[PDB]
Design a protein around this ligand. Sequence first.
Ligand SMILES: [Cl-]
Ligand SMILES: [Cl-]
Ligand SMILES: [Zn+2]
Ligand SMILES: [Zn+2]
Ligand SMILES: [Zn+2]
Ligand SMILES: [Zn+2]
Ligand SMILES: [Zn+2]
Ligand SMILES: [Zn+2]
Length: 375
Amino acid sequence: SYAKKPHISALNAPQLDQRYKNEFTIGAAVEPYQLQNEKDVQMLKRHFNSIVAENVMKPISIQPEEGKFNFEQADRIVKFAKANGMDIRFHTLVWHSQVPQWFFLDKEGKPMVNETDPVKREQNKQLLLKRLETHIKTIVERYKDDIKYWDVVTEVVGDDGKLRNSPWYQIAGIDYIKVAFQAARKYGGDNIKLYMNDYNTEVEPKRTALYNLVKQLKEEGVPIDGIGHQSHIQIGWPSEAEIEKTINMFAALGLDNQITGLDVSMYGWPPRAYPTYDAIPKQKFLDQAARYDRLFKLYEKLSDKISNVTFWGIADNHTWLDSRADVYYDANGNVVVDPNAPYAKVEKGKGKDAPFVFGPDYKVKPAYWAIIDHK
Ligand SMILES: [Cl-]
Ligand SMILES: [Cl-]
Ligand SMILES: [Zn+2]
Ligand SMILES: [Zn+2]
Ligand SMILES: [Zn+2]
Ligand SMILES: [Zn+2]
Ligand SMILES: [Zn+2]
Ligand SMILES: [Zn+2]
């Protein structure tokens, strides 16, 4: 939506959070070093009223060894948020990735998943659940008065619609999920909001499996306040109709919905990326802008069911999507972006994606104009 609107500096542009302030908060995911960078600091102060840690609040960053709690990096994000009146989301108490291996070792240092004895497997379950509770307890006791929104568990449903068979599930079964939420509520109180977080929440069979899991846990009294939709999406997929169906489905259970990791990739899956930002054709940005136009119009339509929309980054110069931006080369060394075309080699994670409404020079993209307006 609109290429005649100028590529002005985002520090001079109408504030994104103020545009949406009655509909939902607008958040950004950050690393502590960005709080020491003038442009990123000015971007966060100008456009965002919610914040989340890209990495420093994941389990391995918080307790990389048992009894070793590293809160300094997370503290810096909390301090910045409080000084600027930003909501805080905690990502994340429990996850099968970026999680320290000491959790899943038995008393003799051996992997719990390998235990054959049912008596010892039960002891390992209780040990893991005790470690889980202490991890959550320590974190929540420190941050309960500062952080309102919590991703308690992340990605616990597999893309096959079964519970993800992580070491958490192998060792302790479904109880690790129940214990995670119960501990967060116990040590954090009734005012913090507890979320189950996942990607491809729009996609069956994961969507209905997520729905059934949360419905069952809540019937058993497990405290779950909402769903965190990572929303790592493409220009085409998933459709707005299916996003709407998903939000409505979980809202019918009385759940809040938060969009926790929004980025609109320029590519399909697996991605065939351009090697640089400059090589991305202008038309891609127009296609992205129209997708963003439709997307935020739908979020506004559903604003009574969505409390927050967070982008997984600030501006196009820094995005985890670059780690997936594989560049395919044909036999002559020319870049191949057509998903079906011949190619000879791939350079994994070497290309550039462009997923936000702010460009890598901190100037606004056509996607910005598409969501700042009221059309
Ligand atoms: Cl309004
Ligand atoms: Cl990253
Ligand atoms: Zn309004
Ligand atoms: Zn603001
Ligand atoms: Zn360049
Ligand atoms: Zn709302
Ligand atoms: Zn990053
Ligand atoms: Zn619009």
